[PDB]
A paper describes a structure:
K54 does not participate or belong to any of the known catalytic sub-sites of ANG6. The variant K54R retains ~49% of enzyme activity. In this PD variant structure this residue is exposed on the surface of the molecule. Also, in the variant structure the Arg side chain makes a water mediated interaction with R51.
Numbering used by the authors: 2 to 121
The structure:
């Protein structure tokens, strides 16, 4: 089963972004189906897939808290953060580009969850 890894890539991987602004967040949150209801906070990781996969191996991760993993290398990221009063669309987002290691959960050497706590 890979359904949760492919879901992870849909929710948290964008390979080649140029501008990582408010409008990027608004756009990509819709492309990936995170707008009914408006998801409160969501972070996309950039670069290649293989660096992210490698977080599950010792090659690029240490264990972390309860059964999570934290990357050794830093990733370019963009956190899209819902604003306005409503959980229902139109969903508008404030973007925060960052550069940092990431925390994921792994299952079968594949990341299936991003811990969003580190990006609040």
């Amino acid at each position: 089963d890979n359904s949760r890894y492919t879901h992870f890539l849909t929710q948290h991987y964008d390979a080649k972004p140029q501008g990582r602004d408010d409008r990027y967040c608004e756009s990509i949150m819709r492309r990936r189906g995170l707008t009914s209801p408006c998801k409160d906070i969501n972070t996309f990781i950039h670069g290649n897939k293989r660096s992210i996969r490698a977080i599950c191996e010792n090659k690029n991760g240490n264990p972390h808290r309860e059964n999570l993993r934290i990357s050794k290398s830093s990733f370019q990221v963009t956190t899209c953060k819902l604003h306005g009063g409503s959980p229902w669309p139109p969903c508008q987002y404030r973007a925060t580009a960052g550069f940092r290691n990431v925390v994921v959960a792994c299952e079968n050497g594949l990341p299936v969850h991003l811990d969003q706590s580190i990006f609040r």
